[PDB]
C-alpha cells in the first residue's frame, strides 16, 4: 500500500505566522494528492486538489505545491479559524491513504 508520511504531526503557531506542512509518499504518486482540513465534528473539508489546485470557495491563504513524492501545504498567514487538523490524502491508488495529520494549535502572541 502507499504510505503517506506527514509532518509535523502537531505544531503551535500564532495568528499571522506562515505554516508549512509536508507529506512524503512511499512511491511516486504524480499529482494525485489532496489536502483536507478537519474540525472534529464536521466531515473533512477539501482545500487543495491534485496537489496545487485551490478548491472553489476556499481562501487563497492555503496553497499546495509539489509532485511525485514530496508535497507541501502552505498557510500564508495563519488565522484563528485555521484551528484544525490538516491531512494529505493520496488518490493515486486504492486503498486510499491519509497522512497522519498535522494538529495545528493556535497560541496567543498576546
Amino acid at each position: 500500500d502507499i504510505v503517506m508520511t506527514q509532518s509535523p504531526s502537531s505544531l503551535s503557531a500564532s495568528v499571522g505566522d506562515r505554516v508549512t506542512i509536508t507529506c512524503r509518499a512511499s512511491q511516486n504518486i504524480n499529482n494525485y494528492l489532496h489536502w483536507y482540513q478537519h474540525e472534529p465534528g464536521k466531515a473533512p473539508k477539501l482545500l487543495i486538489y491534485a496537489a496545487s489546485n485551490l478548491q472553489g470557495g476556499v481562501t487563497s491563504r492555503f496553497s499546495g505545491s509539489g509532485s511525485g513524492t514530496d508535497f507541501t501545504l502552505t498557510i500564508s498567514t495563519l488565522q484563528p479559524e485555521d484551528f484544525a487538523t490538516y491531512y494529505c490524502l493520496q488518490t493515486h491508488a486504492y486503498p486510499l491513504t491519509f497522512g497522519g495529520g498535522t494538529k495545528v494549535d493556535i497560541k496567543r502572541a498576546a
Binding site: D1, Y36, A43, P95, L96, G101
Partner: protein
Amino acid sequence: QVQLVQSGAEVKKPGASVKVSCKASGYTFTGNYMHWVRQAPGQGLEYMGWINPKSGDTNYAQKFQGRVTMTRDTSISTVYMEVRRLRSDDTAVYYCATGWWGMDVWGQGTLVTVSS
C-alpha cells in the same frame, strides 16, 4: 446534488457489532464506489475501505480486514458497514463518501461509542 445521509448515533458494549448505514441520492447508485473513513478521539483520520455497489466487491484497509464487512441494498440505494469485535479504539465518528474515483462527497458522520 449527490447527498449521502447516514444513520444516527450508536452506543455499543465491547465485543458487540454495529452496522452503520449510508443512503445515497442524486447519482446512479451502482455507478460509483462507496468509501468509509473514521476518526477516533485523539487519532488521525483513517481510511477503512470500499464497496462496489454494482458487484458487491469490497476491499478493506489492512487494519480492518476480517473485522469490517460492507454490503449494499440496491433497492434503497444504501451501503452498510458492519464493524465487529468492538473495543474502545472503535469509538469514533464514521463517514461514508463517494465519487467517480475518490471521496468527493461526504455523509454527515455517525458517532459510535463503545462503552463498558
